[PDB]
Amino acid sequence: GTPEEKQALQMAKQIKQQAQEIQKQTEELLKKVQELLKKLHQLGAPEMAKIAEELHKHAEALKQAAEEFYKHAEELHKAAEARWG
Amino acid sequence: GTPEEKQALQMAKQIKQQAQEIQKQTEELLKKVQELLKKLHQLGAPEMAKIAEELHKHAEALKQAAEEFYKHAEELHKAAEARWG
Ligand code: NI
Numbered sequence: 001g002t003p004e005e006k007q008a009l010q011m012a013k014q015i016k017q018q019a020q021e022i023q024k025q026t027e028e029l030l031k032k033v034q035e036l037l038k039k040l041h042q043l044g045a046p047e048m049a050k051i052a053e054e055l056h057k058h059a060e061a062l063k064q065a066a067e068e069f070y071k072h073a074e075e076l077h078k079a080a081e082a083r084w085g
Numbered sequence: 086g087t088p089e090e091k092q093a094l095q096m097a098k099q100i101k102q103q104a105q106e107i108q109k110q111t112e113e114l115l116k117k118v119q120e121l122l123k124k125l126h127q128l129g130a131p132e133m134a135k136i137a138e139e140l141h142k143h144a145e146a147l148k149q150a151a152e153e154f155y156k157h158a159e160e161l162h163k164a165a166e167a168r169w170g
């Protein structure tokens with residue numbers, strides 16, 4: 001394999017790793033938002049609860065975007081390995 | 086702030102902090118995708134370029150969701166401080 005092909009193979013593997021790491025992080029963050037939401041609902045805090053529920057929708061969007069990225073990162077790694085692995 | 090209020094405020098701070106950590110990693114990840122693209126365009130591997138460009142789209146989408154999450158998280162933390170901090 002050429003130095004360059006080998007380089008691109010390794011870049012793809014690194015992107016896949018970082019994608020995995022970010023996805024886990026997004027899962028933990030959603031959990032934290034859920035937790036906070038439960039507490040604010042118990043606190044009779046309607047205006048805080050309202051923004052906490054919009055924040056939970058954003059945490060869902062973030063976890064979803066991370067998962068979508070990871071799917072394509074795996075696909076790119078697969079394709080690189082097929083060619084150059 | 087009552088103890089439970091102060092707890093919700095700490096939970097918001099921790100959500101803010103993790104949001105900042107995630108945004109930073111999504112910036113890094115997009116840089117990696119950009120650098121791979123440069124390399125794949127160079128190797129004239131158009132199928133690989135096609136995957137990488139799709140991944141480029143997803144990296145921007147992911148970084149955008151992390152930025153939007155962080156904006157909302159900071160706004161919630163700041164309201165929580167207004168009430169309880
Ligand atoms: Ni896609």
